[PDB]
Design a protein around this nucleic acid. Structure first.
Ligand SMILES: [Ca+2]
Length: 337
DNA sequence: GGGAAGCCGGC
DNA sequence: CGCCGGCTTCCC
């Protein structure tokens, strides 16, 4: 398999500089409100210590010279959509992982030769750069997971590569904390059990391991540690779809809300097109503007009716638990196929 | 079935 | 930047 993973560097900030070039070379911080937080920081801003998730208040007191802009999501979606469309032209299959990440299966495209894959990846960085002035990072590897890992090692504006010949040697010297699913709490204690690198997984009690990691993840690590891990690039998009409609007025009455919720399972569902969700979320935004959501997960796609049936059920649950008044109601679909 | 808990990771 | 939206597993 030949996977190219493409990661748009600090995408929201890059989009702002492309739109407003006078922002280039000065700190720029993109802000998100739900006090607000940093969604993205450009280079000069990051260089001063501004990080994603940081409260705007703390950011200002380390980058007072930064320009702080509000997040303009619809326009970032427009750029992303365009770049995704550049991508799928070069791919057999493309998995959109988020607004700024995509995995391309180009196996059948470079006629199976990893070398022409690397060059394809170059052409792809250059194309995006010429046409959209967006710099991206790419990783080229035999699978999705390796492609990502080496991509993150190559930040920013990079091109990282793990040749099929190098896979085993690479997997071997790989620290355990560099592995997705392995956060701080359990890296800490895989270390306490003598596991420092992914190879150490091979030489361990599978039961003393299992009891802290979990069955499915122990499996994951084993399969990974022996180059027997491979999940395919599914041709799809993981970006949640849905819309939230503003109501006539505040309401906590199930029957007043019900049709509003029912109509959102149209205004979005038409735009949903071919893809089929496994998860439903009713999103309620209070008069307070707080977000109250009840999601459920079903190992089955979602017909128009399977929504309604579980829709109001979840709307119930929301009303039956929160006391706040509700101003807008909506729906979010995820886990597509 | 589905809520509580712990963990990961994106923001 | 330390917090809370998805997944997995424990528990009732
Ligand atoms: Ca990233």
């Amino acid at each position: 398999m030949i996977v190219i993973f493409v990661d748009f560097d600090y995408f929201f900030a890059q989009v702002e500089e492309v739109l407003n070039p006078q922002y280039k070379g000065k700190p720029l911080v993109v802000c998100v409100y739900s006090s607000g937080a940093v969604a993205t920081a450009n280079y000069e801003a990051r260089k001063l210590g501004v990080k994603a998730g940081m409260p705007i208040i703390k950011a200002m007191q380390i980058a007072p010279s930064a320009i702080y802009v509000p997040m303009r999501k619809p326009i970032y979606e427009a750029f992303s959509n365009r770049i995704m469309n550049l991508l799928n032209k070069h791919a057999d299959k493309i998995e959109v992982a988020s607004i700024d990440e995509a995995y391309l299966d180009v196996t059948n495209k470079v006629e199976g030769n990893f070398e022409n894959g690397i060059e394809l990846a170059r052409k792809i960085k250059q194309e995006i750069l010429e046409k959209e002035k967006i710099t991206v990072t790419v990783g080229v590897a035999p699978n999705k997971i390796l492609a990502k890992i080496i991509a993150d090692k190559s930040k920013p504006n990079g091109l990282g590569v793990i040749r099929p010949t190098e896979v085993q040697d690479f997997l071997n010297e790989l620290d355990i904390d560099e592995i997705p699913g392995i956060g701080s709490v359990l890296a800490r204690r895989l270390n306490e059990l003598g596991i420092q690198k992914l190879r150490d997984i091979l030489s361990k009690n599978y039961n003393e391991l299992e009891k802290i990691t979990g069955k499915a993840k122990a499996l994951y690590l084993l399969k990974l540690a022996q180059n027997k891990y491979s999940e395919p690039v599914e041709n799809k998009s993981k970006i949640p779809h849905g819309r939230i409609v503003t109501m006539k007025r505040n309401s906590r009455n199930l029957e007043e809300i019900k049709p509003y919720l029912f109509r959102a399972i149209e205004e979005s569902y038409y735009k949903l097109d071919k893809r089929i969700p496994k998860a439903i979320h009713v999103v309620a935004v209070t008069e307070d503007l707080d977000i109250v959501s009840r999601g459920r997960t079903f190992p089955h796609g979602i017909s128009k009716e399977t929504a309604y049936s579980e829709s109001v059920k979840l709307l119930q649950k929301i009303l039956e638990e929160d006391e706040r008044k509700i101003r807008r109601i909506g729906v979010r679909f995820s886990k597509f196929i």
